[PDB]
Structure formats: structure tokens, C-alpha cells
Design an enzyme around this catalytic site. Structure first.
Site, PDB file in Angstrom:
ATOM      1  N   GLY A  81       0.813  -1.204   0.000  1.00 17.07           N
ATOM      2  CA  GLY A  81       0.000   0.000   0.000  1.00 17.07           C
ATOM      3  C   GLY A  81       0.845   1.251   0.000  1.00 17.07           C
ATOM      4  O   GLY A  81       2.038   1.202  -0.299  1.00 17.07           O
ATOM      5  N   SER A 108       5.712  -5.595   1.500  1.00 17.67           N
ATOM      6  CA  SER A 108       5.983  -4.188   1.300  1.00 17.67           C
ATOM      7  C   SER A 108       5.661  -3.474   2.581  1.00 17.67           C
ATOM      8  O   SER A 108       6.162  -3.856   3.645  1.00 17.67           O
ATOM      9  CB  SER A 108       5.186  -3.634   0.144  1.00 17.67           C
ATOM     10  N   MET A 109       4.742  -2.521   2.547  1.00 19.05           N
ATOM     11  CA  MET A 109       4.429  -1.829   3.786  1.00 19.05           C
ATOM     12  C   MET A 109       3.845  -2.773   4.822  1.00 19.05           C
ATOM     13  O   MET A 109       3.979  -2.520   6.016  1.00 19.05           O
ATOM     14  CB  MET A 109       3.506  -0.636   3.571  1.00 19.05           C
ATOM     15  N   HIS A 111      10.455  -6.608   0.165  1.00 19.41           N
ATOM     16  CA  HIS A 111      10.653  -5.766  -0.987  1.00 19.41           C
ATOM     17  C   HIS A 111       9.818  -4.522  -0.917  1.00 19.41           C
ATOM     18  O   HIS A 111       8.612  -4.575  -0.682  1.00 19.41           O
ATOM     19  CB  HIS A 111      10.286  -6.505  -2.243  1.00 19.41           C
ATOM     20  N   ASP A 140      11.985  -9.145  -4.876  1.00 21.93           N
ATOM     21  CA  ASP A 140      10.607  -9.601  -4.561  1.00 21.93           C
ATOM     22  C   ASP A 140      10.606 -11.103  -4.284  1.00 21.93           C
ATOM     23  O   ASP A 140       9.940 -11.835  -5.030  1.00 21.93           O
ATOM     24  CB  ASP A 140       9.636  -9.326  -5.711  1.00 21.93           C
TER      25      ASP A 140
END
Lengths: 178, 178, 178, 178, 178, 178, 178, 178, 178, 178, 178
Positions: free
Chosen positions: A65, A94-95, A119, A158
Site C-alpha cells: 500500500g 511491502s508496507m 521488498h 521480490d
């Protein structure tokens, strides 16, 4: 979706999410947006107010996000007095992985079949994104007891980590089977 | 759709799904999504809290869905103390079949005209999907008391099993006519 | 999004935002629109009425928005008697930064990982936009104890400031870690 | 948007707009439409009924809208017994400026950073629009204590006036800082 | 749109439209459709039932609509015992003007800046529309105390009448300033 | 786009692409599709027919595309008698890099500012994609004089190589400045 | 796509496809549709007319398509006097594999990296599709010198065959490297 | 758009662009895409072939475009023997400015009212874009006889330069009035 | 639209626009875009080449368009040797009026019922648009033999001028009736 | 639509419209747009050039269109030397009727079943449209030998005239049966 | 659709429609539109010019269309000197039936399985459509040697007539089997 209603014995009727908020569980599900981030913040502020000495359990199931939205959650968790524990369900990427790793040290958990991705795709111009890139890698390195060089190397790819790999990396403290 | 309201004698008005949640029945209907998976998890956590010693009946009617979403359900069922029984209604496919087979051993049921598909289409890159492929085949082999080789062979094909075939395969324990 | 319900002990059930409004917290989340600006104004007017001597905490998480909508908020904050404190969460940009800087002097706060942008993109004809451009730069210069020349120079560029840079610039008074 | 709920002490729960309607504040936000105009009218009629001797405060934040819709508001304000005060927040343009200028003489207000536009774009055929054009310019001239010639000259141009310019023009009586 | 809630002293909470229905005011706003026409009819039937000897005030702000939908309103107004008064706010056109003119003779009102259009555009085949054309012109001629020839001449043109012109035409009885 | 016409002296008018086909230059621009692949094949077959002993220059500017479409080009280049030289312009990625590396050994070229990506995203089921994955990695290893292990390691990552890096990797033989 | 023009020495200008049609090459690229099938048929009829004793080379690069469209091609190839050779480029699936296998026995070719799929998805009612299912399996069994039972077993699965596997299956006679 | 046809005296009919290509003028109009870049390259290769000793005039009117597409043009211009002169018409921005500055030193021109922007927005991941960022800033610094530090400073901002400013910067050599 | 073909006696067939280009008439019809501007430029360059001493007649019928696109036309007209005459047909507005006024002094014409608008709406940031605003007002003032102050005053308003008003303003030299 | 080709004996092949242009017939079909108006103008200019002493027949079948586009046609017809005759086919409305009435006096024709509408709907602001309204009514009055008052009265209504009514009005001179 | 090319012996290549136009056959296929009507008119005018004494065969296959478009065809057929014969193929309805019946008396034909509908749906206001309704019924009555009363009765209903019924009605003169 229809959200079920449950009855608390005390009677009070709550939707299932409000019923779990009463137990100090905050859910972050799906992408982090300004709206969902603000709901997490509103819940965290509320819970601190009701009882500053009780842990908050922040359950994460999220692909990622907005960075700024995620950072409002991050600062709220660091800011409010009660420890905010975290749990990864399904995934944290991610976040989401950032927020997972950001939970109170010693209380960061994952379920065994979850997948954690550190990542940070970062997607502003070209040097504004780098200020963020560096800031997030430094905070991750702090959370993980890792060198900045290690996060610079790994937040680049990733690849997903198993709960055990995340534990060894330093993103989580424990894996919960029961 | 309009969801009917029913009255519990104790009076309390509930929608029909909340009324059945009160009887410890959790429904998974349609594709498994982050939202529907989280509702299943929220319900499972709630039910454990109300009474850790009472079985939960998880009714599945689902063509499949997200793996990570399904895994959050899977770990929740394995994690929470009360046995989670499962029932296949109509169909269970892909992650739905996984979750069906994942119910408490000895309490996995199907209705006679249901169709169960263990094919896992897995749809990330190319080697991240394989980590999942292998993980799911190993868990299925465990659930079914089958060799990994047998699941590697059968989760490869989109064929449906009758309740009797699923029983012999080892996905379910019993078929319920009455 | 589903907005959680919490119970106030006094019992009264509130959604989480209404529960925080009761604590005099007003949220501005996402772009400033006529509707969201009017909700902020309605809340500010309400809070003044309930108790003119108690501070209002205006939490900002916003990328920008309409100038006139933002100005209605600005004048309301300056107009109503109780001090309106501000806090930047995640980000404050364009009109969001304006409203942040516009909070009561000495009570303008930011969280450590927020990003503040004073760039005013202004997007009417060609000389109507300039009346606005000049008006906003003058008000910013006032808020920041800076020369008009400095704001003319910096509101020109879409660069973000860290909370420390914003503090030195004069947009905020304090940075809150705990 | 989520509209907050507040509690009136007397307890009664109201949404924030209904709570302010109780204080005799009517809001016109965004374009004037048949529906929004009728809500304004319904509120004005209601407020007169509850107490014909108490002022109504009509808050305007609007870029314009339908002439006939605006005229229903105009006639209602002129028709109902209690004085209807007006306030410009953010902006008042086209029909919004008309309705602002149309408030009770001596009670027409603006906030300092608002922008007021008297341009009437009028967008029926070709001579039906002129009947309107002339009618609105005559009413504006009346409201402003200006010659018809002055309104014919100025309602021709899409220029905005500051609150001070509007005060000198005769659209508003006072500018409110506190 | 958010419809405000008001409190009736007796307490009972009503939305603003229901609160005005309690005062026997029925609103027709926007185009006449089967649904909006049926709501008008339902309200008219209700009001007759509650008190057959009290006038009903039907407020019209409408550009036109379906003929058959409008005729259901027309027959209901003529059918129910209590006089149905009418008021034009903003505008009444096509079927709206028809319904305005159709109010109880001696109780048909308009506000001063309203615009009334008797043009009936009639948009079935080619001779089914004429049966309607003639029927509406005859009813209008009846309502207006005018010759059929005059309505045949004037319902032909899309020109608007001022409240004074409508009064002289015979569509309304009075113009209300206060 | 308008494709320019040029005149060949011999006169014959050709579009610019046909004029270059006459010089034995075949262009692959943009994603590899069944249609664009077949045009490349048709051109390669044609050129062999006109003169089996003259080199064909295949210019590649492509982000990738269908594997089977790319393989039809690959086999045609290997099949037809005249050497097919390759040149990378701008970029060659995925199948584009494959086709570049697949040119006649000793005649594979790149321009200095091109970027070459050997990552093969492969996007069928789950084991049909792997047959392709392995087949492409083996062919790449052959083209590059590299171990299968090296291609398995590097075709895994979406990193770009400079022309010099590609030369050292073994994808190209020479870099052309003039 | 722009289709290149080439010059035949005899001069005659042709697009590249027409130039290859002159060499008796017919291309089937992409899905088989009524239009593309009819173009193949038109070309096959034409080529027979020009010289009934010369082979036609039918190049196939196709994922599948309409059965009836494919059958018109099939019957045309069987009907016209000159042998129709086939070649698989990239892929031949479903009807494409059918048409490939249907080429003149002894002249059915594939390129080494092609992939051939004999699965016939058949997508009419429920027994009209079976008449087709059986008809195609019988024709495939004939083409392949295989039992109907073998085609019934294998046309059931969406697995791809390498050129060598197709050769052993009996779909093709030879694999062409040069 | 309809492209006019003109007649060359020698007669030969050409569209206007082909007629100017005959005079060695190549146009780049609008965004740089793979297709438009390849047309520029095809034209440049053609012109070199017809006469390697004659200058090519590359006219640029472009807001920017793909980097790799632009780089194929760049390398072609540097690669082919005849000097490629450049001219800025209207504007040259991002890659357009790059290609303008990249023309043969001493033959880079602009028209007086053109606007040249050297900002490179670069819009891949996060470190692949930087390899490009650095590469373009180094090439610009080379073209301009400027320090890398100066381009790092200026390619950062979306400001436009007048032809005189571009001349002093070093992007162009001359400004053409007549 | 179908563009008619006409025959030139010399025979040569031309579309009607090419036939008029032969007579040195260049048309600008509709909005000025990069493509339409470049066609105008290409035609102007062509015509200069064919005969540098013959006037070019540039016919304008245009509501406006891109500034940079219009400036490429402007500089081309000023740059090329032969006088470029202009004619306004229907209308010339914004950039169209600019280009009209920009024709060779003494040869700028309008047809009697045309409408010329010098308003420059300029629709980049906020100070990049002003550089343009000032540049265009200065050039207009030059073309018109007017003070910069007069153009600053009049290019501000979207009013149209008759051919006579434009002649007196100084945008055109003559009005052509026959 | 497919436009037929016909052969002129002299042989020359023309599309049917070009063949009729050769006979000096210009067609205006459908709405008047900038493009269709410019084609009419281009044809009118062409025809004058080929023979200034021969009549041009302008056939109109048009519901209306842009005023400025229509005025470019109008001025061209008045400007060019040869008489431009007009003919109404099917209909001429708004600008179409204007252009019909604008033909050379004594040569304006209509077919017997055509319908001519002089209503000018004029659909800019509010006083720019009136300059047009008045200009068109004055020109119509001139064309028709009618008072301005008569055109002001009749161009107000969307009524159609028969060819005989148009003849008496003064829009046409003759009606053509054979 | 692809329109075939045929060769006329004289050789001249024509598309099939142009080849039939050469034989004086004009086709009206599909709905009558301004464009298709004008093509019919253009063809009719052309054919009269080539030979005023030779019949034109107008083939109709049309469901209807615009009245004014159809009337331009009608008047052209009545206007031009050579008899225009008509033939109904498939169907003629509404305006198509009108145009069929409108052919030269004694030369109006239909094919045996055609269906002819004289219903005129007429889909302007309400009395403009009636002028058309009456005009078309009168012309039909004329064409058919029927009373106006009979056409008023029958053009009212959407019933189809067989060729024999149309012959007896008077729409056609003959039915053609061979």
C-alpha cells in the site's frame, strides 16, 4: 460482504469486527490506503485511551500500500504507550512487512504458512522516492538488528520468506502454531 | 441479496447468518478473498473465545480463491483450540478442497452430491509459485495420509471427485445423507 | 470500509470517528473537497459550541485539494474561539500543508516520519489564479515567520520536507515521538 | 463520506448536520440542484415553523447551479418570516453569490478568504434565457443598492471579489474574522 | 444527499421530509416518474386517511415527466376528499404545470420568481399520442377557464410564463410573496 | 503512424520498411505477438529464398512477448540457411533477449545504450510452464556458453545489463559505436 | 500491423503474404475463425486451380478455434487434389493440432521448439457437442494410427507435446532442424 | 489527419512527409514511442545509405517519451556516418531535449519561441531507474560541456529554458530567426 | 469525411487539399495540435522550397490549441523567406488569433462575418505559464502596434471582435468582401 | 459507406462525389462542422479558379451546425465571383436554411417535399451569443426582403416551412418539380 | 465487408457496386440516412446525366429511415427525366415502402418472398410530425390509387404485406419470379 453480529455478555450487539476491537484486536486487511490507515490509527488511539497499559494486537494480512499511509500507522504504533504486538496472517508484503517488523520487539508473530516480503517497490519525481527508499531501509535495518547493507541487498528483491526465514532475518520474534 | 431476520428465544433479532454463527456455524461461500477470509478468521477467533471446548462447523461452498487468504483460514483453524469440523456443500475446489481436507481429522464431511476438486491451479514470478505448489502438495498429502507423489500426480488434474471418491482419497471422513 | 463501533462508558455506542470527535479530534483524510471541508467545518463549529475553552485537535493526512474548500476550513479555525491544534500524520501537502501550518502557533505538530510539502500547484483564467497564488504565499509567510520572498521561492517546488525540516522552516512547532 | 454523530444534552444522538440544523444552521454545499435546493427549502420551512422569530443562518459554499433551483431557495428565504442571515465560506458564485447577496440586509456575511463571483453564465432557446438574465440583474441591483447598469456591466465578467470588494460592491454587509 | 433529521415535540425523530409530511406537505421534485408519482399518490392517500377534512399542500418543482405517471397523481388529487392546494417553487413545466393548474381551484399558488411552462412535448405510435394531446389540452382548458383553442395555441410553444402571466392565463390563483 | 515512402533507384516506390527489407533488414518492434512473429518469419523465409547466401540483419527493440510466438522466430532463424545477425536497439527483454542471444554466434550485436534483460517471467497450468522454463534456460545457456546453473540463477531476476555486461555474459559478441 | 511489400522478378509488387502464397505457402495464424478459415480455404482452392500437381505448404501457428471453421479447412485439404503438407510453428493446439495431424501423411512437420496440444475443449446443448467430440477423436485416431481409446484418453488432457513426443504419438512425421 | 500530396519535378507524387524525407528531413513529432522511434531510426538508416556524406536534419517537436525508445534514436544518430543536425520547433522536453542536445555539436538549433526542458522524470523497480538516471545525466553533461553536478542539479527541475537560456546552458549552438 | 478529387490540367489527380496546396494555400482547421501544426510547418517549408519568392496564403479557421504547437507555426512563418499572408474564415481564437495577427504585416485579412478572439486562456506549474503569458502578450502588442498594457488588458477577456473591430485593434489589415 | 466509382468519357475514374464536383455541384450533407465547412470552402475556391464565370450549384441537406463554420461558407459564397445557386434537398435548418437563403438571389431553389427551418437555436457566455443572434437575423432579413422585426419573430420558433411557404417568406425563389 | 472487384470488358476494374451502377442499378440497403440518401441521389443525378432516356433500376432492401432523407430520394426520382423503376428485395418498410411505391407507375416490382410494410412510425414537437404524417399518407394514396382514408387506416398498422397483397393494395405493379 455481510459482516456478522455477535452478542457480548455483560447484552450488547456488535458486528464481529467491533466485537474483536473490544478485545483489543485491530485488523489491517488488504492494501494500505489513506482510509484504511486512518481506521487503524483511529482504533489504536481509541484503545490507548481506554487502557494505556494493555497490549494491542495488530493483525496484518496485506500485500502492501501507500507509504505515507503506512507511516501514519507506524508512527501511531510507536507513539501510543501500550505495546502493539503484531501478527502476520496469510501475508505481509511491502508496507505490510514493514508494519509487521515494526511491532513491539519481542511480540512480533507470524503464523506458519504466512509469506513475508520485505521488498519495497516504492510505487514523486526521482530523488523524493529515494529519500523514502533510504528511510525505509534504515528503519527496517533497525527493526531487524541487521546492517543497512543487508536491507539494501534484500529489500531489492521480490522474494518471499517463510515464517522461519523471517524469524532468522529478524522481522519476527516467534512463529505461532498453537 | 436480502438476508432474512430470525428471532432467537432466550428475544433477540439476528440476521440468518448471525443466528447460525450463534450455533457455531461459519460459512465460506464463493471465492476466498482477503475480506472473506478475514471474516472467517474473525468468526473462528470469536467462537474460540466464547467457548474453547465446543466444535466449530465450517461449511464450505467455494470454487477456490487466493492462496494466502486461504492459508490464513488454515492456520487459524489449526491454531484455535476447539476442533473445527468441515462440511462440503455443493463444491469445494482448489483452496476450498484444501480447507475441507484441512478440517479436524475424523470430522471432515461432505454431502452426497457435492464435487471436490484438489487441483491447485496456483493463479509471483516462477519459483515463488513453486514454493507454494510444493507446500500445498505436502500439506494435502499429510491431510490425506497419501504419499507426496500421489498428490503431485492428482493435484495436477482438474477432475472432480464424488463424495465417495473423496472419502477413499482421504479428503473426507464421512458422507452425510441424514 | 467498515467503520468499527466502540462503547463509551458514562453506555453509548459510537462509530470510531464519532467516538474520537467526542474527545475533540477532527480528522481530515484524503483530498480536501467541498464535502470533506464542510464536514471539518461542521465539526469545528460543533466543538466550539460544546466548549469554547477546550482545544481542538485537527489531524491531517492529506495530499491536497480545492483551495476554496481549504480556505473554508482555514477561516473556520481562525474564527472559532478555542485553539485549534494540528497534527501531521503521514503527509500534508498543498492545502494540507497550508492547514497544518495554519494551526494555532505553538501547537502545530508532526509525527517523525511524515512528509510535508508546501508546493501550491493551484490546480480560473490566468490572473484569478495569481490572486490566489499571492494570497496563499502571504499567509504561509505569516504562519512561518518567513519573508514573502522565501515562500515565493519554496512553494514553487514540489520537494518534501521531513518533520525536522518543516520545524526549521516554521511550518510546525514540535515533532512528536511519544 | 461518513457523517459523524454527536450527542445533544437535554440525550439525543444526531448526525453533525442535524445537530447544527437544531441550532438553525442550514448548509448549501456544492452545486445547487433540484434536490439540494429542495432540502434547503424543507429546512427553511421547518425552522420557521419551530420558531418564526428566530434567525436562520444559511451557510453557503457553492460554485453555482440551476437558476430555478436557486430561485426556489430565494423565494423561500424572502417568504418565510424569520430573517435569514447568510454566510459565505470558501466561495459563492453565480447562484451562490445571488443567494448570498439575497440574505437579510444587514446580516449578509463573508469570511475573509472567501471568493465571491457575481457572474451569471446562465447555463432554454435564446429569449427565455434573457428573461432570466434581466431578472437576475435586476434583483442583484436591488440587493446591492447599485444601478442596473452596474450589474449589467459586472455580472458579465467571471472575476472574483475578495470579501472587502464584495462589501464595497454591496453583496455583503460584514466580514467576520472572529 | 444526506437528509436531515429533526425532532418533533409531542419526542419523535423524523427525516425532514417525513416531518413536513406530518404537516400535510407533499413534495414533487424533479421529473415525474412511476416511482415518484407513486410516492406522491401514496402520500396523498395516507393524508386523506388521517384526516379527510384537512388540506394537502402539494409543492411542485418539476421540469416534466411521464404523462401516465402524472395522470395517476392528477386523478388521485381529484379523487381524494380533502382539497389539494398546489404551490409552484422554482418551476412547473409540462406535466408539472399540468399538476399545478390541476390543484383545487382558488388554492393554486406560485412563488414570484417561478417559471411556468404549459408546453406539452408528449415525449406510442402516432394517433395514441394525439389522444393524449387532446385530452391534456381539454383538461388544461377546463382548469384555466380558457377555450380549447387557446390551449391548443399556447401548449404548442415552449415559452415560460411569470407568476403574473400564469395568474392571468388562469393556471394559478395567487402569487405568494409572504 | 504514417510510414514514409522512399524511392529506390534501379524507379520503385517503397514504404521505408519495405525499402529496408530490400537491404535484408527485418525489424521486430514492440511485443512479440503471433502476428508480429509471423511477419518476422515471413520476411525471413522470403529473404532466404531471394538469396540463401546473404546475411539477414534482425533488429530488435522489444520488451518481450509470447513464448511460442518467439519460438517460431527462433526456429526460423536456426532453420533458414543464411546467417541471421542480430542487433539490439533500445532494449531486448525476455523473449527479445532470447532472440538477440539466439542470433548467429559471432554476429550478435548491441548498441551502447541498449538494455538487455534475460529474465523470463513466463507470463498453462503449473508444470507446462516449467517445461518452458527449463527449455529456455537450457537454450540460453547454450547461446551464452554458460552453465545451466548460471542461467537458472540470472534469468530469475529482472535486472538489466548494459551492452558491456551482456557481452561479458555471452549474449552478444560486439558493441557497435560506429 | 504494417505488412511489407516485396518485389518479384519476372517486376511485380506483392505484400509479403501474397508473395509467399505465390510459392504455395498458406498461413494459419492465430485462432481459427470463420473468416480466417475461409481465407485458408480460398487460398487452397486457388492453389489447386493454378497447379493441381504441386504441393501446398500449410503453416500453422494457432491456439485453436471454431470446430466448424476448422472442419471447412480439413475437408478442403482432403478434397483438393495436390498434397497439403503441414508445418507447426510455435504451436498447434486444439483445432490447430487437428489440422496439423490432418496434413498429408508423410508430409506432416514440426519445428523443434513447437508445442502441440491435442486436447479438444469443445468450447450446442449437451449431445451435439458429443457428436463432435466423438467425431474428432475418431479422425485423430485415424490420423495417428492410434486406437480410439488412446485418443479418448489423451485428448482429455491439456498437456503439450514436444515435437518428438508428437512424432511418436503419430501427429507428425518429421521434425525439421534445417 | 489528411496528409497532403505534393509533386516533385524530375514527375513523382509524394505525401508531404515523404517529400521532405527526400530533402533529408526527419521529423519527430509528439511522444517518443517504440513505433515512432523506429520510424526515425529507419529513416536515419535509409538516409545514410542514400548518401553517407550529406547532413540529416532532425526536427523535434516532442514532450518526451520512452527512454529506451529515445536511446535507439540516440545511438542511431551517433552511429550513422553523416552528421545529424537537430532543430527544436515548439518544444523539446525530457527525451526530446536529450535528442536535441545530442545532435552534432555545432549544428544543434532552436527556433526563438521554443521551450526546452531537460528534466528527466524517468517515468523498472528502484535501482534500474537510477542506472538510467545517472546514464542520462552523464550524457547530458557531455553534450553540454557541463559538470555532472550541474546536470544533476538542473535535470531535477521541470523548468523550461528559452532558446537563449538553452544556448548558454549548452544544449544548442544557435538560434534561428531566418 | 470524404475528400474530393480534382483534376489539374497540365493531367494530374489531386485531392482538393493537395490541389489547393499547389496554389500555395495552407489550411489550419480546427484546434492546433502537434500533428496539425507539424502539417502546417511541413507545408510551409515545402512551399518555400518550391518558390521562395511567392506568397503563401494561410487560411485559419480555428478555436485555439496548444501554445507550443502554435509557436512552431509562428516561427516557421517568420523564418521562411516568402511572405505568409493570412486569412480568417469563420473564426480565429486564442492561438488562432495569434497566428492570424502574426501574418505578414499588410497582408493580414479577415472575412466580414468572422469572429476574432485574442483571449489567451493558457490551458505547466504556475510561473511557467506566466512566462508564456507575458511572451504572447508582448508578441501580440508587437503585431498590433499596441502597448503591452493594452494587450494585457484585452487578452484577459473572452470577447469576440468583428472584422472591423479587429482591423481597428490592429490584428488585421483588411476585410475582404470580394 | 462505400462511395461508387464512375467513369468520365474524355477515360477518368472518379468517385461519384468527385464526378459531380466536375459538374460544379458541391454537397453539404449532414451537420455543418469545421471540417465539412472547410471542404465546402475548398470546393468553392477550386471551382472559381477553374472557371470564374460558371455557376456553382450548392446542394444542401442539413439539420444545422456551427455558426462560425457556416459563416465561412457564407462568406466564401459571397466572396467568390461565380454565382452560387442553392438547392434544398430533404431539409435545410438553422445554418442550413441560412446558407440556402444566402444563395444567389434568383437562383435559390427547393425541392417540393423539403422542409425549411429558419429557427436559429444558437447552440459563448450570454452577450456574445446575442451579437450572433442579431447578426444572423439581420442577414436573414436582407436575404428575404423582410423586416428585421419579421425575422426576429419567426427565427424564434422551431416550425418548418414547406417549399411554398419558404418561397412566400422569401428564402427561396423557385420550387423544382422537373 | 470486403467488396469484390470485377472486370468489365471494353479492360476496367470496378468494385461490384460500381460495376452494377454502370448497368444503371442503384442500391438502397439498410436504413435510409442522410449519407445513404445522398449517395442514392448522387447516383441518380449521375445516371440521368449519362443518358436521360435510359431507365434506372432502384433496388430497395430497407427497414426504414429518416423521412427527410427519404424525401430527398423521392424528389430526385420524380425530378430526373428517365423513369426510375423500383424493386423490392427482402423488404421495404416505412420509408422503404414509400420509395418502392414511388417508383415509376407500371415499373414497380417486388420479389415473391419480400415483405412490404407501409406503416409510417414517424420516429419534431407534436404538430410538425403531423404535417409529415398527412403529407406521406396523401402521397401514398396517390401512388396506390387509393383513398386517403384507406392509407390513413392502413399506414396506422405495422402489418406486412406479401408481394401479392402489395400488388392488390397498389404499391407494386408486378411480382418477378424470373
Amino acid at each position: 460482504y455481510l459482516v456478522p453480529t455477535v452478542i457480548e455478555q455483560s447484552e450488547r450487539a456488535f458486528d464481529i469486527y467491533s466485537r474483536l476491537l473490544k478485545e483489543r484486536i485491530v485488523f489491517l486487511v488488504g492494501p494500505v490506503t489513506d482510509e484504511s490507515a486512518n481506521l487503524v490509527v483511529a482504533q489504536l488511539l481509541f484503545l490507548e485511551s481506554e487502557n494505556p497499559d494493555k497490549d494491542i494486537f495488530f493483525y496484518i494480512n496485506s500485500p502492501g500500500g501507500s507509504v505515507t499511509a503506512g507511516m501514519s500507522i507506524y508512527d501511531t504504533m510507536n507513539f501510543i504507550k501500550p505495546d502493539v504486538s503484531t501478527l502476520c496472517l496469510g501475508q505481509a508484503a511491502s508496507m505490510g512487512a514493514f508494519l509487521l517488523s515494526a511491532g513491539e520487539k519481542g511480540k512480533r508473530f507470524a503464523l506458519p504458512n504466512s509469506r513475508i516480503m520485505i521488498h519495497q517497490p516504492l510505487i514523486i519525481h526521482a530523488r523524493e522516492l529515494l529519500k523514502i527508499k533510504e528511510k525505509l531501509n534504515r528503519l527496517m535495518a533497525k527493526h531487524c538488528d541487521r546492517d543497512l547493507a543487508d536491507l539494501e541487498r534484500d529489500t531489492d528483491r521480490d522474494n518471499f520468506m517463510s515464517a522461519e526465514e523471517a524469524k532468522e532475518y529478524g522481522l519476527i520474534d516467534q512463529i505461532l502454531e498453537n
